[PDB]
Amino acid sequence: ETLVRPKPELLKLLKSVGAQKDTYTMKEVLFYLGQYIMTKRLYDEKQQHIVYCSNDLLGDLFGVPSFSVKEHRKIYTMIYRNLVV
Ligand SMILES: CC[C@@H]1CC[C@@H](C(=O)N2CCN(C(C)=O)[C@H](C)C2)N1C(=O)C1=C(C(C)C)N2C(=N[C@@](C)(c3ccc(Cl)cc3)[C@H]2c2ccc(Cl)cc2)S1
């Protein structure tokens, strides 16, 4: 539905997992974010609800060393701090 426009650095991250537009639905952003987390192993097998993104571009952009996958609104907050008109 509605389109969001990533800042350059987030756009960089999305493109590193094969994205090729300037604008995306939130659903597409989360798809690519998932791909990025899985292909970079940004988690620990013993804690499957936590993304560990400290010392990764993703942590720089989201401004946190880890976050919970069950905390959806905060995930949207962090994405929105990386969005532009
Ligand atoms: C944080 C990633 C977690 C840890 C392990 C792995 C997982 O369950 N498995 C399944 C079990 N397994 C094996 C080897 O059998 C592996 C450990 C892989 N895993 C995931 O697959 C998850 C995924 C992958 C598709 C990325 N997601 C999850 N919530 C998902 C469904 C999700 C959560 C929140 C929101 Cl808003 C949207 C989607 C998705 C995801 C997507 C984007 C972001 Cl930023 C965070 C999470 S939980």
From Swiss-Prot:
Annotated segments matching region Sufficient to promote the mitochondrial pathway of apoptosis: 1-77
Something else known: MDM2 RING finger mutations that failed to ubiquitinate p53 in vitro did not target p53 for degradation when expressed in cells.
Quaternary structure annotation from Swiss-Prot or TrEMBL: Interacts with p53/TP53, TP73/p73, RBL5 and RP11. Binds specifically to RNA. Can interact with RB1, E1A-associated protein EP300 and the E2F1 transcription factor. Forms a ternary complex with p53/TP53 and WWOX. Interacts with CDKN2AIP, RFWD3, USP7, PYHIN1, and RBBP6. Interacts with ARRB1 and ARRB2. Interacts with PSMA3. Found in a trimeric complex with MDM2, MDM4 and USP2. Interacts with USP2 (via N-terminus and C-terminus). Interacts with MDM4. Part of a complex with MDM2, DAXX, RASSF1 and USP7. Part of a complex with DAXX, MDM2 and USP7. Interacts directly with DAXX and USP7. (Microbial infection) Interacts with herpes virus 8 protein v-IRF4.
Function: E3 ubiquitin-protein ligase that mediates ubiquitination of p53/TP53, leading to its degradation by the proteasome. Inhibits p53/TP53- and p73/TP73-mediated cell cycle arrest and apoptosis by binding its transcriptional activation domain. Also acts as a ubiquitin ligase E3 toward itself and ARRB1. Permits the nuclear export of p53/TP53. Promotes proteasome-dependent ubiquitin-independent degradation of retinoblastoma RB1 protein. Inhibits DAXX-mediated apoptosis by inducing its ubiquitination and degradation. Component of the TRIM28/KAP1-MDM2-p53/TP53 complex involved in stabilizing p53/TP53.
Associated clinical condition: Seems to be amplified in certain tumors (including soft tissue sarcomas, osteosarcomas and gliomas). A higher frequency of splice variants lacking p53 binding domain sequences was found in late-stage and high-grade ovarian and bladder carcinomas. Four of the splice variants show loss of p53 binding.
Description of its domains: Region I is sufficient for binding p53 and inhibiting its G1 arrest and apoptosis functions. It also binds p73 and E2F1. Region II contains most of a central acidic region required for interaction with ribosomal protein L5 and a putative C4-type zinc finger. The RING finger domain which coordinates two molecules of zinc interacts specifically with RNA whether or not zinc is present and mediates the heterooligomerization with MDM4. It is also essential for its ubiquitin ligase E3 activity toward p53 and itself.
Name this protein carries in UniProt: E3 ubiquitin-protein ligase Mdm2
Naturally occurring in which organism (per UniProt): Homo sapiens (Human)
